Nucleic acid binder design. Structure first.
Lengths: 168, 50, 526, 52, 48, 155, 59
RNA sequence: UUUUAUAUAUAUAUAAUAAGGAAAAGUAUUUAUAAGAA
């Protein structure tokens, strides 16, 4: 299941130094996202001294471990707007009409492509770090999103009642 | 290219499997006469239809 | 006590008199118990909104007035009646939150609410199997602890189980439960009957046959799908419960009184299902065999024809006017039906389920035989009585006498039964049946039972029939006539997209942009 | 182009259509009733008060 | 009746009208018939 | 009718939800009472009770100017599946900038357009509008063709 | 009809047969998105000198 | 809780007593759309 269905895309690939007394030691950080495009996604991180390949390797395993189900509306978009603050990134994301593109920041684009979020429009305010953007994106996707079924049951209402009325 | 940009329609049209909404990116061209000839197999190319 | 009896007689005026009397002359306002009784009143009159308002006030006024587990059970009953399972679940969570202690009735009522909610995909929101499962889980949680029991709760528990058995199409469990209930009721009554068993056999069987069990069993029959798998099959507690009940039923059959259940654990074919449906229906109509009405002979036919000839031709002259002669015939036929067969098991509801069995099972012949044998059209009866009126006042006559005689076997065709036969026509795609039924409905509009009803109910039922006709012409592929029916009555009926979704889909398949546009304009002009 | 959206997406102005009768006709009773109705004076008033 | 769309049906009627006229005048040529028969056999045939 | 008191109530409900308190209290004013009733009818609040500052009322008490100062409305909060039903509560119409919308702009807001920099209605959301001193759901306000002031947004 | 405003008298007696009336109107400020009031002082004719500071009047 | 009973000085302390149980089948148009990089 895991290899054939999950798709891996590197999001961050960089060199971070830890200057020790003898000299500058340089290691490789990699941040990746694995998603089946069908409502399951996860993020992974890896750190390797000798070659980035090992960093991406451990990142792939870590992403596989943290693979989690993601709420989705019609299997194409978020249930409602998500306004989320994560360690200095402000993500404002909006659900969209069918056929709407992924008109978002690129990091969010790969995350949505991996997780099967077809439709979204969003803006990133305050800091624009890709690392924090990705972490906050997944967190706001899973914590900050509530399914209409769950909302209705928590309110003890039928889906017909909670569903919005059509106006024109 | 600067003509295709003007011709390009940012708003598309759509009337269990998944609808491939964004394959309709170039559906606007399908109503041009030369494209209609090529799709009707009345020419071996769009340039030949032209 | 005043409100208790007023509820039991369903007298709204008496409620107003007693409450106003106490408030005006005595300074007495309803407490928690009286307000719970008022909620039960509102539930009796099917006034759900007022019941919820009263419940809110009980919470609002004071902690003494605050609802307890009894009022919560009543509110769960209201949820059952409205098939509102999210509110029932939320309420159960409230009883847990407010630290109120559940009772046996709370679990049984929750199980019944879930069973009723799981009837259709529409009312169940597409979680029907899950809801039946959750009702079973609530019954298990009941089985865990002693709680507080009530003399009636046991009966309800059986019904609750049967509900979960009936809506899932589990014939074998429904049969087992029906047999066990009837057997225990019969043995308990016979063991505790003051008189001799033989003479009072009629009363014993009338007490034994609870129409609710029959209706639930016939619902279990109607929802038969051979490819279905019971929800109770999967679980270990569920499979153990199923095994225990089926073993008990088997042993009881292996070991007086007899029931016509076929000698098989399960019915695997539609034909056997029809056979058992006819068997149990006939047994109930006969009061368990005490009344020998359904069995017939040409001797009995001729003698009864002679007797009703004498009776009716004598009564014809005596009546002052044709209206009074109709009143006498009505009284005679009505009392005759009750003496003939038990009133309770024979009614619109059980008949609706019984006729619904073949429709789901897809046999036309059995459905039409049952409809003809157990139903009569009102206008036909009135015409027959007019014919016999002119005949006596001033083989067809033998036919009319036999008709008035066989009315003991029949119930009038109400709007709901006509709509059921329309559903049968849709399912079987019989144009002749559809034409016959919308002729008979048009005639029935003239007869006095239809005009007795209120105008809004008449218009709602006519809108339902128009929608059924639209569905029939849609499935037959005659789209133009469906659009014609919609267009002709656009003003008289409020047409919603929920009604015309089938038509809109089937028009869009062929891309009739003109017809789609006109239909959508009719619906959405608003 | 944006402002035209306010007017049905119409670019360009016709001259304002003139009135054949510049003042209300006698048969048009309602305007006469409003004109000869009691004039309101108060918080929302149209004329000088009695003693003013 | 035939599981087709209305606009396709109308196009079929118009094209068969043109085909009728051409057949009446025999404007169709042997090369055209050969191309028609060739192209007809390159595509799956619709079933009613 | 203070938007200040209503804002204080909104923040109080938010805080009470975040620390997971079952029962709390709010001022006993008709604006607060109508607010609590509309939240309760929509399933956000478990129950409403009358009471004093000390707690809910044991027996029924008449409301008079003598006891009005200490009267309180005790609202019970719902927590389902380890989450708060009344997750968040906001005021759209601040005391500074008050938003009185006509019916057409309420329809636009319910239909997804942003009017007067108000983020439009969301699926699981509730918006309350006060018209002629009666609080009501925005959908009902549109249903009754009532012009009104949009007050708040509870999600 | 003739323009009519509701105002508050501010200065009276400094002039002959003339008063100053503070008039308040409502206007939508798009920039701050607020229905805010605007003030202006009208020189108004007082004949009969029946005006005093602090009177609510219609001009 | 409420109602009464005894006792004591309309009230107080004690004892007993509690009316809220209902069962039924069938009955789309969702809209406006804001991306960042070095």
């Amino acid at each position: 299941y895991i290899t054939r269905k999950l798709t891996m895309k590197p999001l961050v690939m960089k060199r971070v130094s830890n200057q020790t007394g003898k000299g500058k030691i340089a290691s490789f950080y990699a941040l990746v996202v694995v998603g089946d495009k069908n409502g399951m996604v996860g993020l992974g991180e890896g750190k390797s001294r000798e070659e980035m390949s090992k960093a991406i390797f451990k990142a792939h395993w870590d992403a596989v471990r943290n693979l989690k189900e993601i709420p989705r509306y019609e299997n194409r978009t978020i249930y409602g707007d998500i306004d989320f603050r994560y360690h200095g990134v402000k993500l404002h994301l909006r659900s969209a009409k069918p056929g709407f593109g992924l008109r978002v920041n690129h990091v969010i684009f790969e995350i949505c492509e991996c997780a099967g979020i077809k439709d979204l429009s969003g803006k990133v305010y305050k800091s624009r770090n890709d690392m924090n953007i990705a972490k906050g994106t997944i967190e706001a996707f899973t914590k900050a999103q509530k399914t209409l079924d769950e909302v209705a049951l928590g309110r003890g209402k039928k889906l017909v009642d909670v569903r919005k009325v059509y106006y024109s | 290219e600067k003509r295709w940009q003007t011709v390009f329609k940012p708003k598309l049209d759509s009337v269990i499997k998944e609808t491939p909404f964004l394959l309709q990116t170039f559906a606007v061209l399908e109503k041009r006469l030369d494209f209609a000839l090529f799709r009707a197999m009345f020419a071996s190319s769009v340039r030949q239809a032209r | 006590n005043c409100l208790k009896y007023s509820t039991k007689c369903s007298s709204f005026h008496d409620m107003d008199y007693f409450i106003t009397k106490f408030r005006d002359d005595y300074g007495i306002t309803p407490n928690k118990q009286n307000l719970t009784t008022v909620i039960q009143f509102y539930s009796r009159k099917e006034m759900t909104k007022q019941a919820w308002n009263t419940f809110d006030t009980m919470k609002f006024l004071s902690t003494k007035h605050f609802p307890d587990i009894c009022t919560y059970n009543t509110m769960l009953r209201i949820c059952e009646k409205e098939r509102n399972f999210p509110k029932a679940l939320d309420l159960f969570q409230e009883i847990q939150d407010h630290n109120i202690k559940p009772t046996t009735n709370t679990y049984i009522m929750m199980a019944r609410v879930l069973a009723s909610s799981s009837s259709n995909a529409v009312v169940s929101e597409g979680k029907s199997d899950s809801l039946r499962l959750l009702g079973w889980k609530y019954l298990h949680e009941l089985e865990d602890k002693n709680l507080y029991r009530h003399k009636k709760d046991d009966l309800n528990l059986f019904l609750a189980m049967m509900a979960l058995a009936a809506f899932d199409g589990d014939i074998e469990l429904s049969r087992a439960l029906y047999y066990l209930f009837i057997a225990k009721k019969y043995k308990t009554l016979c063991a505790n009957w003051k008189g001799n068993i033989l003479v009072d056999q009629d009363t014993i069987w009338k007490s034994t046959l609870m129409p609710e069990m029959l209706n639930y069993l016939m619902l279990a029959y109607a929802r038969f799908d051979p490819r279905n798998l019971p929800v109770l099959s999967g679980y270990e507690k569920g499979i153990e419960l199923r095994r225990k009940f089926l073993r008990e039923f088997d042993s009881s059959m292996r070991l007086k009184f007899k029931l016509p259940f076929l000698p098989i654990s399960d019915l695997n074919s539609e034909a056997q299902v029809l056979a058992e449906s006819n068997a149990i229906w006939s047994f109930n109509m006969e009061n368990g065999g005490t009344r020998n009405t359904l069995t017939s002979s040409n001797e009995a036919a001729l003698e009864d024809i002679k007797k009703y000839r004498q009776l009716l031709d004598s009564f014809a002259q005596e009546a002052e006017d044709f209206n009074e002669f109709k009143f006498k015939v009505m009284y005679e036929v009505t009392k005759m039906q009750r003496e003939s067969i038990n009133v309770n098991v024979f009614n619109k509801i059980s008949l609706h389920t019984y006729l619904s069995i073949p429709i789901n099972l897809k046999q036309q012949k059995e459905f039409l035989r049952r409809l003809t044998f157990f139903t009569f059209q009102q206008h036909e009866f009135e015409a027959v009585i007019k014919r016999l009126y002119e005949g006596y006042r001033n083989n067809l006559i033998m036919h009319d006498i036999w008709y008035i005689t066989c009315l003991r076997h029949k119930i009038m065709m109400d709007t709901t039964l006509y709509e059921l036969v329309m559903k049968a026509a849709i399912e079987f795609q019989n144009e002749d049946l559809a034409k016959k039924v919308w002729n008979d409905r048009g005639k029935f509009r003239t007869t006095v039972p239809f005009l007795k009803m209120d105008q809004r109910i008449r218009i709602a039922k006519d809108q339902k029939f128009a929608h059924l006709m639209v569905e029939f012409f849609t499935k037959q592929g005659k789209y133009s006539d469906a659009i014609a029916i919609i267009l002709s009555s656009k003003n008289r009926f409020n047409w919603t997209y929920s009604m015309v979704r089938n038509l809109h889909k089937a028009l869009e398949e062929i891309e009739d942009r003109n017809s789609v546009e006109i239909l959508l304009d009719v619906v959405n002009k608003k | 182009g944006k402002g035209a959206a306010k007017y049905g997406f119409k670019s360009g102005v016709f001259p304002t259509t003139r009135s054949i009768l510049k003042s209300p006709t006698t048969k048009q009773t309602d305007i006469i009733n409003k004109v000869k109705s009691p004039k309101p004076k108060g918080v929302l008033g149209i004329g000088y008060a009695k003693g003013v | 009746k035939y599981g087709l769309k209305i606009p396709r049906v109308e196009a079929i009627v118009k094209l068969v009208s043109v085909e009728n006229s051409w057949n009446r005048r025999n404007r169709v040529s042997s090369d055209l018939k050969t191309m028609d028969e060739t192209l007809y056999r390159m595509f799956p045939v619709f079933d009613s | 009718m203070s938007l200040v008191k209503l804002a204080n109530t909104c923040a109080h409900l938010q805080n009470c939800s975040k620390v997971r308190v079952a029962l709390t209290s709010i001022p006993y004013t008709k604006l607060q009472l109508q607010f609590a009733y509309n939240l309760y009818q929509q399933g956000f609040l478990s129950s409403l009770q009358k009471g004093s500052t000390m707690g809910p009322d044991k027996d029924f008490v008449e409301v008079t100017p003598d006891n009005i100062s200490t009267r309180r409305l005790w609202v019970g909060l719902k927590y389902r599946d380890n989450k708060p039903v009344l997750s968040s509560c906001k005021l759209i119409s601040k005391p500074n900038s008050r938003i009185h919308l006509p019916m057409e702009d309420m329809k636009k807001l319910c239909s997804g357009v942003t009017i007067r920099n108000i983020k439009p209605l969301q699926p699981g959301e509730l918006i309350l509008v006060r018209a002629h001193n009666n609080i009501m759901d925005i959908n009902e306000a549109i249903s009754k063709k009532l012009d009104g002031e949009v007050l708040c947004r509870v999600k | 009809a003739r323009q009519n405003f509701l105002g508050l008298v501010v200065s009276q007696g400094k002039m002959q047969k003339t008063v100053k009336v503070r008039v308040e109107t409502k206007v939508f400020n798009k920039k701050i998105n607020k229905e805010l009031f605007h003030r202006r002082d009208y020189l108004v004719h007082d004949e009969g000198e029946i005006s005093r500071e602090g009177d609510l009047v219609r001009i």
